[PDB]
Nucleic acid binder design. Structure first.
Ligand SMILES: Nc1ncnc2c1ncn2[C@H]1C[C@H](O)[C@@H](COP(=O)(O)O)O1
Ligand SMILES: [Mn+2]
Ligand SMILES: [Mn+2]
Ligand SMILES: [Mn+2]
Ligand SMILES: [Mn+2]
Ligand SMILES: [Mn+2]
Ligand SMILES: [Mn+2]
Ligand code: NA
Length: 346
DNA sequence: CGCTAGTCGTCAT
DNA sequence: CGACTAGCG
Protein backbone atom coordinates (compact mmCIF):
# COMPACT_ATOMS: atom_id res chain seq x y z
CA UNK A 1 0.00 0.00 0.00
CA UNK A 2 1.20 3.56 -0.64
CA UNK A 3 1.18 5.26 2.76
CA UNK A 4 -1.18 8.23 2.62
CA UNK A 5 -1.90 7.98 -1.12
CA UNK A 6 -5.67 7.96 -0.52
CA UNK A 7 -5.52 11.36 1.27
CA UNK A 8 -2.98 12.70 -1.19
CA UNK A 9 -5.22 12.20 -4.21
CA UNK A 10 -8.50 12.66 -2.37
CA UNK A 11 -9.77 15.34 -4.82
CA UNK A 12 -10.05 12.66 -7.50
CA UNK A 13 -12.38 10.63 -5.34
CA UNK A 14 -16.11 10.62 -5.71
CA UNK A 15 -18.71 9.22 -3.28
CA UNK A 16 -20.87 6.66 -5.05
CA UNK A 17 -23.29 3.85 -4.58
CA UNK A 18 -22.51 0.48 -6.23
CA UNK A 19 -25.90 0.36 -8.00
CA UNK A 20 -23.90 2.51 -10.42
CA UNK A 21 -22.46 -0.80 -11.73
CA UNK A 22 -25.76 -2.69 -11.94
CA UNK A 23 -25.61 -5.21 -14.77
CA UNK A 24 -21.84 -4.98 -14.90
CA UNK A 25 -18.97 -7.04 -13.52
CA UNK A 26 -16.93 -6.08 -10.48
CA UNK A 27 -13.87 -7.94 -9.12
CA UNK A 28 -13.25 -7.93 -5.37
CA UNK A 29 -10.05 -7.83 -3.31
CA UNK A 30 -11.55 -10.47 -0.97
CA UNK A 31 -8.78 -10.43 1.69
CA UNK A 32 -10.11 -7.06 2.88
CA UNK A 33 -13.46 -8.65 3.77
CA UNK A 34 -11.73 -11.78 5.12
CA UNK A 35 -9.58 -9.70 7.45
CA UNK A 36 -12.49 -7.56 8.70
CA UNK A 37 -14.62 -10.68 9.18
CA UNK A 38 -11.92 -12.64 10.98
CA UNK A 39 -11.54 -9.83 13.50
CA UNK A 40 -15.14 -10.46 14.68
CA UNK A 41 -14.18 -14.02 15.70
CA UNK A 42 -10.56 -13.41 16.66
CA UNK A 43 -10.77 -15.08 20.08
CA UNK A 44 -11.85 -18.39 18.64
CA UNK A 45 -9.34 -18.16 15.78
CA UNK A 46 -6.43 -17.43 18.16
CA UNK A 47 -7.49 -20.24 20.51
CA UNK A 48 -7.79 -22.66 17.59
CA UNK A 49 -11.51 -23.23 18.13
CA UNK A 50 -13.63 -23.76 14.98
CA UNK A 51 -15.37 -20.77 13.41
CA UNK A 52 -17.01 -19.81 10.14
CA UNK A 53 -18.30 -16.36 11.13
CA UNK A 54 -16.01 -14.67 8.60
CA UNK A 55 -17.83 -16.61 5.87
CA UNK A 56 -21.15 -15.01 6.82
CA UNK A 57 -19.38 -11.64 7.00
CA UNK A 58 -18.03 -11.83 3.44
CA UNK A 59 -21.34 -13.30 2.27
CA UNK A 60 -23.46 -10.37 3.40
CA UNK A 61 -21.28 -8.22 1.13
CA UNK A 62 -21.56 -10.65 -1.77
CA UNK A 63 -25.33 -10.87 -1.33
CA UNK A 64 -25.56 -7.10 -1.13
CA UNK A 65 -23.74 -6.88 -4.45
CA UNK A 66 -26.08 -9.45 -6.00
CA UNK A 67 -29.21 -7.61 -4.78
CA UNK A 68 -28.19 -4.73 -7.04
CA UNK A 69 -27.62 -6.84 -10.12
CA UNK A 70 -23.83 -6.79 -9.74
CA UNK A 71 -21.65 -9.69 -10.94
CA UNK A 72 -18.93 -10.07 -8.32
CA UNK A 73 -15.72 -12.01 -8.97
CA UNK A 74 -13.96 -12.81 -5.71
CA UNK A 75 -10.16 -12.73 -6.11
CA UNK A 76 -7.71 -14.17 -3.55
CA UNK A 77 -3.99 -13.90 -2.87
CA UNK A 78 -2.04 -17.00 -3.95
CA UNK A 79 1.65 -17.84 -3.60
CA UNK A 80 3.97 -15.51 -1.77
CA UNK A 81 5.79 -12.98 -3.90
CA UNK A 82 9.56 -12.68 -3.30
CA UNK A 83 9.41 -8.89 -3.82
CA UNK A 84 6.98 -8.76 -0.87
CA UNK A 85 8.49 -11.47 1.37
CA UNK A 86 10.24 -9.07 3.75
CA UNK A 87 7.05 -7.04 4.39
CA UNK A 88 5.16 -10.28 4.91
CA UNK A 89 7.72 -11.57 7.40
CA UNK A 90 7.32 -8.34 9.34
CA UNK A 91 3.59 -8.86 9.56
CA UNK A 92 4.09 -12.41 10.72
CA UNK A 93 6.46 -11.19 13.41
CA UNK A 94 3.94 -8.68 14.74
CA UNK A 95 1.19 -11.28 14.67
CA UNK A 96 3.36 -13.80 16.48
CA UNK A 97 3.95 -11.28 19.26
CA UNK A 98 0.30 -10.37 19.55
CA UNK A 99 -0.44 -14.07 19.94
CA UNK A 100 2.01 -14.69 22.80
CA UNK A 101 1.25 -11.47 24.66
CA UNK A 102 -2.39 -12.38 24.07
CA UNK A 103 -2.15 -15.83 25.65
CA UNK A 104 0.06 -14.38 28.36
CA UNK A 105 -2.72 -11.96 29.27
CA UNK A 106 -5.19 -14.85 29.46
CA UNK A 107 -2.97 -16.33 32.16
CA UNK A 108 -3.03 -13.00 34.00
CA UNK A 109 -6.81 -12.75 34.09
CA UNK A 110 -6.90 -9.68 31.85
CA UNK A 111 -9.21 -10.53 28.93
CA UNK A 112 -9.94 -6.98 27.76
CA UNK A 113 -6.34 -6.48 26.64
CA UNK A 114 -6.04 -10.14 25.61
CA UNK A 115 -8.81 -9.67 23.04
CA UNK A 116 -7.16 -6.48 21.81
CA UNK A 117 -4.07 -8.62 21.22
CA UNK A 118 -6.02 -11.45 19.60
CA UNK A 119 -7.58 -9.03 17.15
CA UNK A 120 -4.07 -7.98 16.07
CA UNK A 121 -2.69 -11.50 15.62
CA UNK A 122 -5.13 -13.06 13.19
CA UNK A 123 -3.59 -14.81 10.24
CA UNK A 124 -5.78 -15.40 7.21
CA UNK A 125 -5.28 -18.95 6.11
CA UNK A 126 -5.94 -20.54 2.75
CA UNK A 127 -8.37 -22.95 4.34
CA UNK A 128 -10.46 -19.95 5.48
CA UNK A 129 -10.29 -18.45 2.00
CA UNK A 130 -11.39 -21.76 0.52
CA UNK A 131 -14.37 -21.82 2.90
CA UNK A 132 -15.37 -18.41 1.51
CA UNK A 133 -14.87 -19.80 -2.02
CA UNK A 134 -17.20 -22.77 -1.46
CA UNK A 135 -19.81 -20.48 0.17
CA UNK A 136 -19.59 -18.12 -2.80
CA UNK A 137 -19.84 -20.85 -5.39
CA UNK A 138 -22.96 -22.12 -3.61
CA UNK A 139 -24.48 -18.79 -4.78
CA UNK A 140 -23.21 -18.93 -8.39
CA UNK A 141 -20.39 -16.44 -7.80
CA UNK A 142 -17.07 -16.81 -9.64
CA UNK A 143 -13.86 -17.01 -7.58
CA UNK A 144 -10.24 -16.76 -8.72
CA UNK A 145 -7.03 -17.46 -6.76
CA UNK A 146 -4.27 -15.22 -8.08
CA UNK A 147 -0.92 -16.88 -8.76
CA UNK A 148 0.67 -14.15 -6.63
CA UNK A 149 -0.79 -10.90 -5.24
CA UNK A 150 -4.47 -10.33 -5.91
CA UNK A 151 -3.57 -6.66 -6.61
CA UNK A 152 -2.02 -7.58 -9.95
CA UNK A 153 -4.75 -10.10 -10.83
CA UNK A 154 -7.39 -7.43 -10.13
CA UNK A 155 -5.52 -4.84 -12.20
CA UNK A 156 -5.31 -7.36 -15.04
CA UNK A 157 -9.01 -8.21 -14.89
CA UNK A 158 -9.73 -4.47 -14.98
CA UNK A 159 -7.33 -3.59 -17.81
CA UNK A 160 -8.55 -6.54 -19.89
CA UNK A 161 -12.11 -5.25 -19.70
CA UNK A 162 -13.13 -8.40 -17.86
CA UNK A 163 -14.34 -6.28 -14.94
CA UNK A 164 -15.40 -2.63 -14.91
CA UNK A 165 -14.26 -1.82 -11.39
CA UNK A 166 -12.23 -3.18 -8.49
CA UNK A 167 -13.48 -3.27 -4.91
CA UNK A 168 -10.59 -2.94 -2.44
CA UNK A 169 -9.27 -1.02 0.57
CA UNK A 170 -5.85 -0.83 -1.06
CA UNK A 171 -4.44 2.22 -2.89
CA UNK A 172 -1.77 0.13 -4.63
CA UNK A 173 -4.36 -0.85 -7.20
CA UNK A 174 -3.94 2.59 -8.78
CA UNK A 175 -0.17 2.14 -9.01
CA UNK A 176 -0.84 -1.12 -10.91
CA UNK A 177 -2.81 0.94 -13.43
CA UNK A 178 -6.37 0.09 -12.45
CA UNK A 179 -9.06 2.06 -14.35
CA UNK A 180 -11.70 2.23 -11.61
CA UNK A 181 -11.36 1.55 -7.90
CA UNK A 182 -14.02 1.45 -5.17
CA UNK A 183 -12.70 2.04 -1.65
CA UNK A 184 -14.29 2.26 1.79
CA UNK A 185 -17.37 0.37 0.57
CA UNK A 186 -19.70 -0.59 3.43
CA UNK A 187 -22.30 -3.33 3.81
CA UNK A 188 -24.96 -1.10 2.21
CA UNK A 189 -23.10 -0.29 -1.00
CA UNK A 190 -21.73 3.15 -0.14
CA UNK A 191 -18.11 3.74 -1.17
CA UNK A 192 -15.52 6.09 -2.71
CA UNK A 193 -14.53 5.79 -6.33
CA UNK A 194 -11.27 6.89 -7.90
CA UNK A 195 -10.91 6.77 -11.69
CA UNK A 196 -7.42 6.72 -13.22
CA UNK A 197 -8.59 9.27 -15.82
CA UNK A 198 -9.62 11.69 -13.07
CA UNK A 199 -6.25 11.90 -11.26
CA UNK A 200 -5.89 15.25 -13.01
CA UNK A 201 -8.54 16.51 -10.57
CA UNK A 202 -5.68 16.57 -8.05
CA UNK A 203 -3.90 19.89 -8.44
CA UNK A 204 -1.30 18.62 -6.00
CA UNK A 205 -0.12 16.08 -8.60
CA UNK A 206 0.76 18.57 -11.31
CA UNK A 207 1.60 16.65 -14.50
CA UNK A 208 2.23 13.45 -12.50
CA UNK A 209 -1.07 11.95 -13.55
CA UNK A 210 0.26 9.71 -16.35
CA UNK A 211 0.46 6.00 -15.52
CA UNK A 212 4.29 5.81 -15.69
CA UNK A 213 5.05 8.92 -13.63
CA UNK A 214 2.33 8.08 -11.10
CA UNK A 215 3.92 4.62 -10.67
CA UNK A 216 7.39 6.12 -10.22
CA UNK A 217 6.01 8.47 -7.59
CA UNK A 218 4.33 5.63 -5.69
CA UNK A 219 7.52 3.61 -5.67
CA UNK A 220 9.57 6.63 -4.55
CA UNK A 221 7.19 7.36 -1.71
CA UNK A 222 7.80 3.87 -0.37
CA UNK A 223 5.89 0.69 -1.16
CA UNK A 224 5.78 -3.00 -0.24
CA UNK A 225 8.57 -3.77 -2.71
CA UNK A 226 10.93 -0.98 -1.72
CA UNK A 227 11.33 1.28 1.26
CA UNK A 228 11.70 4.98 0.64
CA UNK A 229 14.90 6.92 1.11
CA UNK A 230 15.18 8.63 4.51
CA UNK A 231 12.71 11.53 4.55
CA UNK A 232 10.97 10.87 1.24
CA UNK A 233 7.22 10.47 0.97
CA UNK A 234 4.52 11.28 -1.57
CA UNK A 235 4.94 15.05 -1.41
CA UNK A 236 8.70 15.00 -2.06
CA UNK A 237 8.46 12.22 -4.65
CA UNK A 238 5.70 13.98 -6.53
CA UNK A 239 7.70 17.25 -6.43
CA UNK A 240 10.78 15.44 -7.81
CA UNK A 241 8.82 14.05 -10.74
CA UNK A 242 7.23 17.45 -11.39
CA UNK A 243 10.53 19.32 -11.59
CA UNK A 244 11.99 16.36 -13.50
CA UNK A 245 12.56 17.30 -17.12
CA UNK A 246 14.61 14.22 -18.00
CA UNK A 247 12.85 11.12 -19.43
CA UNK A 248 15.28 8.66 -17.85
CA UNK A 249 14.17 7.98 -14.27
CA UNK A 250 17.55 6.64 -13.09
CA UNK A 251 19.36 9.96 -13.68
CA UNK A 252 16.51 11.73 -11.92
CA UNK A 253 16.85 9.48 -8.88
CA UNK A 254 20.61 10.12 -8.95
CA UNK A 255 19.88 13.86 -8.78
CA UNK A 256 17.03 13.56 -6.29
CA UNK A 257 19.06 15.54 -3.77
CA UNK A 258 19.46 18.33 -6.28
CA UNK A 259 15.74 18.45 -7.05
CA UNK A 260 14.80 18.83 -3.36
CA UNK A 261 17.73 21.00 -2.23
CA UNK A 262 18.77 18.29 0.24
CA UNK A 263 21.83 16.16 0.94
CA UNK A 264 20.31 12.77 0.08
CA UNK A 265 22.64 9.79 0.04
CA UNK A 266 21.39 7.40 -2.62
CA UNK A 267 22.81 3.85 -2.30
CA UNK A 268 23.78 2.12 -5.58
CA UNK A 269 21.50 -0.73 -4.66
CA UNK A 270 18.56 1.66 -4.26
CA UNK A 271 18.57 2.01 -8.04
CA UNK A 272 18.44 -1.70 -8.74
CA UNK A 273 15.73 -2.08 -6.13
CA UNK A 274 13.77 0.71 -7.80
CA UNK A 275 14.09 -1.06 -11.14
CA UNK A 276 13.00 -4.19 -9.30
CA UNK A 277 9.93 -2.57 -7.79
CA UNK A 278 9.01 -0.96 -11.10
CA UNK A 279 9.29 -4.31 -12.82
CA UNK A 280 7.16 -5.91 -10.14
CA UNK A 281 4.34 -3.39 -10.64
CA UNK A 282 4.66 -3.92 -14.40
CA UNK A 283 5.34 -7.60 -14.94
CA UNK A 284 3.97 -9.55 -11.96
CA UNK A 285 2.43 -12.79 -13.12
CA UNK A 286 -1.32 -13.12 -13.32
CA UNK A 287 -3.67 -15.72 -14.64
CA UNK A 288 -5.67 -15.17 -17.82
CA UNK A 289 -8.93 -16.95 -16.97
CA UNK A 290 -9.98 -17.01 -20.63
CA UNK A 291 -6.88 -18.45 -22.22
CA UNK A 292 -6.19 -20.28 -18.94
CA UNK A 293 -2.50 -19.49 -18.69
CA UNK A 294 0.07 -17.47 -16.77
CA UNK A 295 1.04 -14.06 -18.13
CA UNK A 296 2.77 -10.96 -16.91
CA UNK A 297 0.38 -8.14 -15.99
CA UNK A 298 1.79 -6.17 -18.96
CA UNK A 299 3.58 -7.56 -22.02
CA UNK A 300 7.37 -7.51 -21.77
CA UNK A 301 9.00 -4.44 -23.35
CA UNK A 302 12.17 -4.52 -25.41
CA UNK A 303 14.06 -3.05 -22.44
CA UNK A 304 13.31 -5.91 -20.05
CA UNK A 305 14.84 -9.39 -19.98
CA UNK A 306 12.18 -11.72 -18.44
CA UNK A 307 14.85 -14.09 -17.13
CA UNK A 308 15.83 -11.44 -14.60
CA UNK A 309 12.25 -11.18 -13.32
CA UNK A 310 12.06 -14.06 -10.80
CA UNK A 311 11.24 -11.59 -8.04
CA UNK A 312 7.99 -10.82 -9.91
CA UNK A 313 6.84 -14.43 -9.63
CA UNK A 314 8.00 -17.79 -10.96
CA UNK A 315 6.22 -19.43 -13.89
CA UNK A 316 4.56 -22.82 -13.32
CA UNK A 317 2.87 -25.13 -15.83
CA UNK A 318 -0.47 -23.72 -16.95
CA UNK A 319 -2.38 -26.80 -15.71
CA UNK A 320 -1.02 -26.23 -12.19
CA UNK A 321 -1.78 -22.48 -12.44
CA UNK A 322 -5.33 -23.38 -13.43
CA UNK A 323 -5.79 -25.74 -10.47
CA UNK A 324 -4.47 -23.00 -8.18
CA UNK A 325 -6.81 -20.41 -9.75
CA UNK A 326 -9.77 -22.69 -9.28
CA UNK A 327 -8.81 -23.00 -5.61
CA UNK A 328 -8.39 -26.74 -6.11
CA UNK A 329 -4.71 -26.82 -5.29
CA UNK A 330 -3.47 -26.00 -1.79
CA UNK A 331 -0.90 -23.22 -2.07
CA UNK A 332 1.50 -24.71 0.49
CA UNK A 333 1.44 -28.45 -0.12
CA UNK A 334 0.48 -28.23 -3.79
CA UNK A 335 -1.89 -31.08 -3.07
CA UNK A 336 -5.44 -31.25 -4.46
CA UNK A 337 -7.97 -30.32 -1.75
CA UNK A 338 -11.06 -29.91 -3.98
CA UNK A 339 -12.46 -31.04 -7.35
CA UNK A 340 -14.33 -28.08 -8.87
CA UNK A 341 -14.87 -28.35 -12.64
CA UNK A 342 -16.45 -25.25 -14.23
CA UNK A 343 -16.63 -26.86 -17.67
CA UNK A 344 -19.42 -29.24 -16.65
CA UNK A 345 -15.66 -16.43 -16.15
CA UNK A 346 -13.84 -19.38 -17.75
C1' DC B 1 4.28 25.06 8.92
C1' DG B 2 4.32 20.56 5.78
C1' DC B 3 5.69 16.32 6.01
C1' DT B 4 7.43 11.65 7.37
C1' DA B 5 7.79 7.78 10.29
C1' DG B 6 5.75 4.72 13.66
C1' DT B 7 1.63 3.07 16.40
C1' DC B 8 -3.08 1.65 16.48
C1' DG B 9 -7.55 -0.21 14.33
C1' DT B 10 -10.68 -3.08 11.00
C1' DC B 11 -15.77 -6.65 14.36
C1' DA B 12 -19.64 -5.45 17.10
C1' DT B 13 -23.48 -5.47 21.52
C1' DC C 1 -4.73 -3.07 4.32
C1' DG C 2 -5.65 2.16 6.36
C1' DA C 3 -6.22 6.34 9.80
C1' DC C 4 -4.07 9.14 13.17
C1' DT C 5 -0.51 11.71 15.36
C1' DA C 6 3.65 13.05 17.74
C1' DG C 7 7.71 14.88 16.36
C1' DC C 8 11.06 15.58 12.62
C1' DG C 9 13.20 19.28 9.76
N1 LIG D 1 -4.30 -6.25 9.47
C1 LIG D 1 -4.80 -6.16 8.23
N2 LIG D 1 -5.99 -5.53 8.04
C2 LIG D 1 -6.47 -5.44 6.80
N3 LIG D 1 -5.95 -5.91 5.66
C3 LIG D 1 -4.77 -6.52 5.88
C4 LIG D 1 -4.14 -6.69 7.10
N4 LIG D 1 -2.93 -7.37 6.95
C5 LIG D 1 -2.86 -7.60 5.66
N5 LIG D 1 -3.93 -7.13 4.95
C6 LIG D 1 -4.13 -7.21 3.50
C7 LIG D 1 -2.84 -6.98 2.72
C8 LIG D 1 -3.03 -7.85 1.48
O1 LIG D 1 -3.68 -7.15 0.43
C9 LIG D 1 -3.91 -8.99 1.98
C10 LIG D 1 -3.15 -10.26 2.32
O2 LIG D 1 -2.15 -9.99 3.30
P1 LIG D 1 -1.58 -11.16 4.24
O3 LIG D 1 -0.64 -10.50 5.17
O4 LIG D 1 -1.11 -12.26 3.36
O5 LIG D 1 -2.71 -11.68 5.05
O6 LIG D 1 -4.58 -8.50 3.17
MN1 LIG E 1 -15.19 -9.07 18.82
MN1 LIG F 1 2.32 -21.15 -7.44
MN1 LIG G 1 -3.08 -7.12 -1.70
MN1 LIG H 1 -1.14 -3.82 -2.35
MN1 LIG I 1 9.33 -0.90 -26.73
MN1 LIG J 1 1.45 18.39 13.64
NA1 NA K 1 8.23 7.09 2.75
Amino acid sequence: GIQGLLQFIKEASEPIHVRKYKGQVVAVDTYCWLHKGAIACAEKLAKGEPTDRYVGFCMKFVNMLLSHGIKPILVFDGCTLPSKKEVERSRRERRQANLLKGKQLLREGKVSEARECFTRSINITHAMAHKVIKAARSQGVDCLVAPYEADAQLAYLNKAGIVQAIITEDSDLLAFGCKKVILKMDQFGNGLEIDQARLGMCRQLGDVFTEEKFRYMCILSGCAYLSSLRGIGLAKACKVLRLANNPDIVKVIKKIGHYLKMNITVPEDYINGFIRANNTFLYQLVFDPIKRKLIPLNAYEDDVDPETLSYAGQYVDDSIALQIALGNKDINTFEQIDDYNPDTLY
